[PDB]
Protein backbone atom coordinates (compact mmCIF):
# COMPACT_ATOMS: atom_id res chain seq x y z
CA UNK A 1 0.00 0.00 0.00
CA UNK A 2 2.78 2.42 0.96
CA UNK A 3 4.80 1.50 -2.14
CA UNK A 4 2.75 3.92 -4.26
CA UNK A 5 3.37 6.74 -1.76
CA UNK A 6 7.09 5.95 -1.70
CA UNK A 7 7.25 6.00 -5.50
CA UNK A 8 5.36 9.31 -5.62
CA UNK A 9 7.74 10.87 -3.09
CA UNK A 10 10.77 9.56 -4.98
CA UNK A 11 9.37 11.11 -8.17
CA UNK A 12 8.86 14.37 -6.27
CA UNK A 13 12.46 14.36 -5.01
CA UNK A 14 13.70 13.62 -8.54
CA UNK A 15 11.66 16.54 -9.86
CA UNK A 16 13.10 18.79 -7.15
CA UNK A 17 16.65 17.70 -8.01
CA UNK A 18 16.04 18.33 -11.72
CA UNK A 19 14.52 21.75 -11.04
CA UNK A 20 17.41 22.68 -8.74
CA UNK A 21 19.98 22.30 -11.56
CA UNK A 22 20.53 24.98 -14.21
CA UNK A 23 24.09 24.65 -15.57
CA UNK A 24 26.46 21.72 -15.14
CA UNK A 25 29.99 22.01 -13.79
CA UNK A 26 31.43 21.73 -17.31
CA UNK A 27 29.47 24.77 -18.54
CA UNK A 28 30.81 26.99 -15.76
CA UNK A 29 34.38 25.62 -15.71
CA UNK A 30 35.09 25.42 -19.46
CA UNK A 31 36.51 28.96 -19.30
CA UNK A 32 39.43 28.20 -16.97
CA UNK A 33 42.69 26.83 -18.34
CA UNK A 34 43.33 23.07 -18.29
CA UNK A 35 45.76 21.59 -15.80
CA UNK A 36 47.81 20.11 -18.65
CA UNK A 37 49.87 16.95 -18.82
CA UNK A 38 51.31 15.70 -15.52
CA UNK A 39 54.51 13.67 -15.17
CA UNK A 40 54.72 11.48 -12.06
CA UNK A 41 57.71 9.29 -11.22
CA UNK A 42 58.02 6.50 -8.66
CA UNK A 43 60.24 8.16 -6.05
CA UNK A 44 60.09 5.20 -3.64
CA UNK A 45 59.20 1.56 -4.31
CA UNK A 46 58.34 -0.28 -1.10
CA UNK A 47 58.91 -4.04 -1.22
CA UNK A 48 58.44 -6.73 1.40
CA UNK A 49 54.84 -7.92 1.22
CA UNK A 50 54.39 -11.67 0.84
CA UNK A 51 51.05 -11.42 -0.99
CA UNK A 52 48.69 -8.86 -2.50
CA UNK A 53 47.83 -5.62 -0.67
CA UNK A 54 44.23 -4.49 -0.29
CA UNK A 55 44.40 -1.15 1.54
CA UNK A 56 46.66 1.37 3.23
CA UNK A 57 46.33 4.59 5.20
CA UNK A 58 48.82 7.44 5.42
CA UNK A 59 49.75 8.75 8.83
CA UNK A 60 48.93 12.24 10.01
CA UNK A 61 52.53 13.40 9.49
CA UNK A 62 52.32 12.29 5.82
CA UNK A 63 55.45 10.20 6.45
CA UNK A 64 54.40 6.80 7.84
CA UNK A 65 51.90 4.42 6.26
CA UNK A 66 50.36 1.08 7.24
CA UNK A 67 49.72 -1.58 4.58
CA UNK A 68 47.64 -4.76 4.90
CA UNK A 69 48.30 -7.89 2.86
CA UNK A 70 46.61 -11.28 2.58
CA UNK A 71 49.71 -12.92 4.07
CA UNK A 72 48.41 -11.63 7.40
CA UNK A 73 51.03 -8.93 8.04
CA UNK A 74 50.14 -5.32 8.89
CA UNK A 75 53.45 -3.77 7.86
CA UNK A 76 54.12 -0.17 8.91
CA UNK A 77 56.51 1.78 6.69
CA UNK A 78 58.54 4.99 6.74
CA UNK A 79 58.07 6.46 3.27
CA UNK A 80 61.01 8.87 3.53
CA UNK A 81 63.57 6.14 4.31
CA UNK A 82 61.67 3.02 3.09
CA UNK A 83 62.20 1.33 6.46
CA UNK A 84 59.75 -1.04 8.15
CA UNK A 85 59.11 0.39 11.61
CA UNK A 86 56.82 -2.48 12.63
CA UNK A 87 55.41 -5.74 11.29
CA UNK A 88 52.24 -6.88 13.06
CA UNK A 89 51.05 -10.45 12.36
CA UNK A 90 47.29 -10.86 12.07
CA UNK A 91 45.10 -13.46 13.73
CA UNK A 92 43.02 -13.72 10.54
CA UNK A 93 44.94 -14.51 7.36
CA UNK A 94 42.42 -12.61 5.22
CA UNK A 95 42.33 -8.83 5.68
CA UNK A 96 40.27 -6.35 3.66
CA UNK A 97 41.21 -2.97 5.18
CA UNK A 98 43.45 -1.10 7.59
CA UNK A 99 43.57 2.29 9.27
CA UNK A 100 45.95 4.72 10.95
CA UNK A 101 44.64 6.76 13.87
CA UNK A 102 45.16 10.54 13.64
CA UNK A 103 47.23 10.49 16.83
CA UNK A 104 49.31 7.64 15.39
CA UNK A 105 49.14 5.58 18.58
CA UNK A 106 46.65 2.98 17.31
CA UNK A 107 46.32 1.06 14.04
CA UNK A 108 43.12 -0.74 13.06
CA UNK A 109 42.66 -3.88 10.98
CA UNK A 110 39.71 -5.97 9.80
CA UNK A 111 38.97 -8.62 7.20
CA UNK A 112 36.73 -11.57 6.43
CA UNK A 113 36.67 -12.63 10.10
CA UNK A 114 33.94 -10.02 10.83
CA UNK A 115 36.11 -8.77 13.73
CA UNK A 116 37.74 -5.33 13.85
CA UNK A 117 41.20 -5.67 15.40
CA UNK A 118 42.89 -2.63 16.94
CA UNK A 119 46.61 -2.63 17.74
CA UNK A 120 48.55 -0.38 20.12
CA UNK A 121 51.84 0.83 18.66
CA UNK A 122 53.43 2.09 21.89
CA UNK A 123 52.84 -4.23 19.65
CA UNK A 124 49.89 -6.31 20.85
CA UNK A 125 46.19 -6.26 20.05
CA UNK A 126 44.40 -3.76 22.28
CA UNK A 127 40.71 -4.41 21.58
CA UNK A 128 38.97 -6.79 19.18
CA UNK A 129 35.58 -5.48 18.05
CA UNK A 130 32.85 -7.98 17.21
CA UNK A 131 29.20 -7.72 16.27
CA UNK A 132 29.22 -7.60 12.47
CA UNK A 133 27.37 -10.28 10.51
CA UNK A 134 29.32 -9.74 7.28
CA UNK A 135 32.95 -9.15 6.40
CA UNK A 136 34.40 -5.77 7.29
CA UNK A 137 35.28 -3.52 4.38
CA UNK A 138 36.70 -0.22 5.66
CA UNK A 139 37.65 1.32 9.01
CA UNK A 140 38.58 4.90 9.88
CA UNK A 141 39.21 6.78 13.12
CA UNK A 142 37.14 9.76 14.20
CA UNK A 143 39.64 10.24 17.04
CA UNK A 144 41.77 8.08 19.32
CA UNK A 145 38.60 6.87 21.08
CA UNK A 146 36.12 6.05 18.28
CA UNK A 147 36.18 4.11 15.01
CA UNK A 148 33.63 3.51 12.24
CA UNK A 149 33.53 0.10 10.55
CA UNK A 150 31.39 -0.76 7.52
CA UNK A 151 30.75 -4.46 6.96
CA UNK A 152 28.98 -6.81 4.57
CA UNK A 153 25.92 -6.86 6.83
CA UNK A 154 24.84 -3.72 4.88
CA UNK A 155 25.27 -1.77 8.14
CA UNK A 156 27.85 0.83 9.16
CA UNK A 157 28.57 1.09 12.88
CA UNK A 158 30.41 3.47 15.20
CA UNK A 159 32.45 1.73 17.90
CA UNK A 160 33.97 2.76 21.22
CA UNK A 161 37.42 1.44 22.09
CA UNK A 162 37.13 1.46 25.89
CA UNK A 163 33.69 -0.14 26.08
CA UNK A 164 34.13 -2.39 23.05
CA UNK A 165 30.43 -2.09 22.21
CA UNK A 166 29.09 -0.21 19.20
CA UNK A 167 27.57 3.15 20.12
CA UNK A 168 25.19 3.29 17.15
CA UNK A 169 24.38 1.40 13.97
CA UNK A 170 23.47 2.87 10.59
CA UNK A 171 20.95 1.01 8.44
CA UNK A 172 19.29 1.67 5.11
CA UNK A 173 21.55 0.05 2.51
CA UNK A 174 20.10 -2.67 0.30
CA UNK A 175 23.50 -4.12 -0.60
CA UNK A 176 26.67 -4.57 1.40
CA UNK A 177 28.78 -1.43 1.83
CA UNK A 178 32.28 -1.52 0.36
CA UNK A 179 33.88 1.81 1.31
CA UNK A 180 33.55 4.89 3.48
CA UNK A 181 35.30 8.21 4.08
CA UNK A 182 35.08 10.55 7.05
CA UNK A 183 34.51 14.27 6.72
CA UNK A 184 37.43 16.60 7.54
CA UNK A 185 35.53 17.83 10.62
CA UNK A 186 34.22 14.28 11.33
CA UNK A 187 30.69 15.70 11.66
CA UNK A 188 29.41 13.91 8.54
CA UNK A 189 30.14 10.54 6.97
CA UNK A 190 29.45 8.68 3.71
CA UNK A 191 29.52 5.07 2.57
CA UNK A 192 29.09 3.45 -0.83
CA UNK A 193 27.24 0.15 -1.06
CA UNK A 194 26.74 -2.37 -3.88
CA UNK A 195 23.24 -1.06 -4.69
CA UNK A 196 24.87 1.77 -6.71
CA UNK A 197 23.88 4.20 -3.93
CA UNK A 198 26.15 6.34 -1.75
CA UNK A 199 24.56 7.65 1.44
CA UNK A 200 25.65 10.54 3.65
CA UNK A 201 25.33 9.48 7.28
CA UNK A 202 25.65 11.43 10.54
CA UNK A 203 27.89 10.24 13.37
CA UNK A 204 25.71 12.14 15.87
CA UNK A 205 22.11 11.69 14.73
CA UNK A 206 22.67 8.35 13.01
CA UNK A 207 20.31 8.91 10.07
CA UNK A 208 21.25 9.21 6.40
CA UNK A 209 20.29 12.74 5.37
CA UNK A 210 20.88 12.22 1.64
CA UNK A 211 21.31 9.35 -0.80
CA UNK A 212 22.79 9.50 -4.30
CA UNK A 213 22.11 6.68 -6.77
CA UNK A 214 23.62 7.94 -10.01
CA UNK A 215 25.72 4.82 -10.56
CA UNK A 216 24.71 1.76 -12.55
CA UNK A 217 26.78 -0.90 -10.74
CA UNK A 218 28.29 -1.56 -7.32
CA UNK A 219 30.39 1.19 -5.74
CA UNK A 220 33.94 0.22 -4.75
CA UNK A 221 35.45 3.53 -3.61
CA UNK A 222 34.46 6.86 -2.09
CA UNK A 223 36.24 9.95 -0.79
CA UNK A 224 35.33 13.49 0.23
CA UNK A 225 36.43 16.58 -1.60
CA UNK A 226 38.86 18.46 0.68
CA UNK A 227 36.23 21.17 1.13
CA UNK A 228 33.93 18.60 2.73
CA UNK A 229 30.96 19.71 0.60
CA UNK A 230 31.45 17.09 -2.12
CA UNK A 231 32.65 13.54 -2.62
CA UNK A 232 33.69 11.21 -5.43
CA UNK A 233 32.37 7.67 -5.90
CA UNK A 234 34.13 5.06 -8.00
CA UNK A 235 32.04 2.13 -9.21
CA UNK A 236 32.46 -0.89 -11.49
CA UNK A 237 30.68 0.94 -14.33
CA UNK A 238 34.09 2.32 -15.43
CA UNK A 239 32.94 5.78 -14.27
CA UNK A 240 34.00 8.07 -11.44
CA UNK A 241 31.35 10.57 -10.38
CA UNK A 242 31.62 13.74 -8.28
CA UNK A 243 28.50 14.29 -6.19
CA UNK A 244 27.63 17.48 -4.31
CA UNK A 245 25.95 17.51 -0.90
CA UNK A 246 24.50 21.02 -1.12
CA UNK A 247 23.08 20.33 -4.59
CA UNK A 248 22.05 16.79 -3.54
CA UNK A 249 22.93 15.45 -6.99
CA UNK A 250 25.68 14.52 -9.43
CA UNK A 251 27.88 17.22 -10.97
CA UNK A 252 30.33 15.50 -13.33
CA UNK A 253 31.10 12.00 -14.57
CA UNK A 254 34.62 10.81 -15.39
CA UNK A 255 34.71 8.18 -18.13
CA UNK A 256 36.38 7.39 -21.44
CA UNK A 257 35.42 5.19 -24.37
CA UNK A 258 38.69 3.25 -24.09
CA UNK A 259 38.30 2.21 -20.44
CA UNK A 260 35.89 -0.69 -19.87
CA UNK A 261 37.10 -1.69 -16.39
CA UNK A 262 35.90 -0.68 -12.95
CA UNK A 263 37.55 1.57 -10.38
CA UNK A 264 39.02 0.27 -7.12
CA UNK A 265 40.08 3.35 -5.15
CA UNK A 266 39.45 7.08 -5.56
CA UNK A 267 41.21 9.93 -3.78
CA UNK A 268 41.52 13.69 -4.20
CA UNK A 269 44.50 16.02 -4.15
CA UNK A 270 45.13 18.58 -1.41
CA UNK A 271 43.39 21.34 -3.39
CA UNK A 272 40.91 18.93 -4.97
CA UNK A 273 41.92 19.77 -8.54
CA UNK A 274 43.23 16.26 -9.26
CA UNK A 275 40.94 13.25 -8.81
CA UNK A 276 43.19 10.20 -8.66
CA UNK A 277 41.42 6.92 -9.40
CA UNK A 278 42.89 3.42 -9.31
CA UNK A 279 41.61 1.21 -12.12
CA UNK A 280 41.34 -2.51 -12.82
CA UNK A 281 43.49 -2.04 -15.96
CA UNK A 282 46.77 -2.30 -13.98
CA UNK A 283 47.15 1.50 -13.87
CA UNK A 284 45.92 4.61 -12.06
CA UNK A 285 44.42 7.49 -14.03
CA UNK A 286 44.45 11.06 -12.71
CA UNK A 287 41.61 13.37 -13.74
CA UNK A 288 40.85 17.08 -13.64
CA UNK A 289 37.94 17.61 -11.26
CA UNK A 290 36.71 20.78 -12.98
CA UNK A 291 37.42 19.50 -16.51
CA UNK A 292 36.75 15.71 -16.52
CA UNK A 293 39.73 15.39 -18.89
CA UNK A 294 42.39 12.85 -17.95
CA UNK A 295 45.81 14.47 -17.50
CA UNK A 296 48.25 11.66 -16.69
CA UNK A 297 48.44 7.88 -16.41
CA UNK A 298 50.28 5.94 -13.69
CA UNK A 299 50.98 2.58 -15.35
CA UNK A 300 53.86 1.41 -13.16
CA UNK A 301 52.03 -1.48 -11.49
CA UNK A 302 52.27 -5.06 -12.74
CA UNK A 303 49.02 -6.26 -11.13
CA UNK A 304 45.72 -4.64 -10.22
CA UNK A 305 45.80 -1.69 -7.82
CA UNK A 306 43.75 -2.02 -4.64
CA UNK A 307 44.32 1.27 -2.80
CA UNK A 308 45.31 4.89 -3.33
CA UNK A 309 46.08 7.47 -0.67
CA UNK A 310 47.25 11.07 -1.02
CA UNK A 311 49.31 12.39 1.88
CA UNK A 312 47.86 14.92 4.30
CA UNK A 313 50.68 17.24 3.24
CA UNK A 314 49.66 16.78 -0.40
CA UNK A 315 53.21 15.73 -1.29
CA UNK A 316 53.02 12.10 -2.45
CA UNK A 317 50.52 9.55 -3.75
CA UNK A 318 50.85 5.91 -2.68
CA UNK A 319 49.23 3.06 -4.62
CA UNK A 320 49.38 -0.52 -3.37
CA UNK A 321 48.67 -3.18 -5.97
CA UNK A 322 48.09 -6.93 -6.13
CA UNK A 323 51.72 -7.59 -7.11
CA UNK A 324 52.83 -7.31 -3.45
CA UNK A 325 54.46 -3.94 -4.26
CA UNK A 326 53.46 -0.54 -2.86
CA UNK A 327 54.88 2.35 -4.91
CA UNK A 328 55.22 5.98 -3.81
CA UNK A 329 54.54 8.54 -6.54
CA UNK A 330 55.10 12.28 -6.69
Amino acid sequence: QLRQEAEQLKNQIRDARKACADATLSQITNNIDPVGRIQMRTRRTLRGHLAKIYAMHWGTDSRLLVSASQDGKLIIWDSYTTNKVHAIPLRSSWVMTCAYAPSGNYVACGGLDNICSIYNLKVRVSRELAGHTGYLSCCRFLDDNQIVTSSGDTTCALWDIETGQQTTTFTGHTGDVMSLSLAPDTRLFVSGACDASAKLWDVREGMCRQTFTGHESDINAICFFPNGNAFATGSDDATCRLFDLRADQELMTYSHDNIICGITSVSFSKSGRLLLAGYDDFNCNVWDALKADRAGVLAGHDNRVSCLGVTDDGMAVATGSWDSFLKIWN
Binding site: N229, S271, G272, M315
Partner: protein, 50 residues
Protein backbone atom coordinates in the same frame (compact mmCIF):
# COMPACT_ATOMS: atom_id res chain seq x y z
CA UNK B 1 7.82 0.14 7.02
CA UNK B 2 10.38 2.79 7.97
CA UNK B 3 11.57 3.25 4.37
CA UNK B 4 8.72 5.65 3.58
CA UNK B 5 9.45 7.73 6.69
CA UNK B 6 13.17 7.83 5.89
CA UNK B 7 12.54 8.91 2.30
CA UNK B 8 10.03 11.55 3.42
CA UNK B 9 12.66 12.92 5.81
CA UNK B 10 15.17 12.89 2.95
CA UNK B 11 12.84 14.82 0.64
CA UNK B 12 12.39 17.84 2.94
CA UNK B 13 15.91 19.26 2.61
CA UNK B 14 16.80 22.79 1.54
CA UNK B 15 18.90 22.83 -1.63
CA UNK B 16 20.99 25.43 -3.43
CA UNK B 17 21.29 25.84 -7.19
CA UNK B 18 24.03 23.82 -8.87
CA UNK B 19 25.55 27.04 -10.21
CA UNK B 20 26.35 28.26 -6.70
CA UNK B 21 27.91 24.95 -5.64
CA UNK B 22 29.92 24.71 -8.86
CA UNK B 23 31.17 28.28 -8.43
CA UNK B 24 32.12 27.54 -4.82
CA UNK B 25 34.08 24.44 -5.82
CA UNK B 26 35.83 26.31 -8.64
CA UNK B 27 36.70 29.20 -6.32
CA UNK B 28 38.09 26.80 -3.72
CA UNK B 29 40.23 25.04 -6.34
CA UNK B 30 41.52 28.35 -7.70
CA UNK B 31 42.26 29.81 -4.26
CA UNK B 32 44.00 26.75 -2.80
CA UNK B 33 45.86 25.79 -6.00
CA UNK B 34 49.08 27.46 -4.82
CA UNK B 35 49.50 25.02 -1.91
CA UNK B 36 49.41 21.85 -4.01
CA UNK B 37 52.72 20.05 -4.56
CA UNK B 38 51.01 17.65 -6.98
CA UNK B 39 49.76 20.37 -9.35
CA UNK B 40 53.01 22.36 -9.38
CA UNK B 41 56.07 20.08 -9.66
CA UNK B 42 58.03 20.76 -6.47
CA UNK B 43 61.74 21.52 -6.94
CA UNK B 44 64.17 18.78 -5.94
CA UNK B 45 65.38 20.97 -3.07
CA UNK B 46 61.79 21.37 -1.86
CA UNK B 47 60.88 17.73 -2.54
CA UNK B 48 61.39 15.67 0.64
CA UNK B 49 61.44 12.32 -1.18
CA UNK B 50 64.17 13.21 -3.69
Amino acid sequence: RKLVEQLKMEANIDRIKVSKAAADLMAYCEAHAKEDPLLTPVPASENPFR
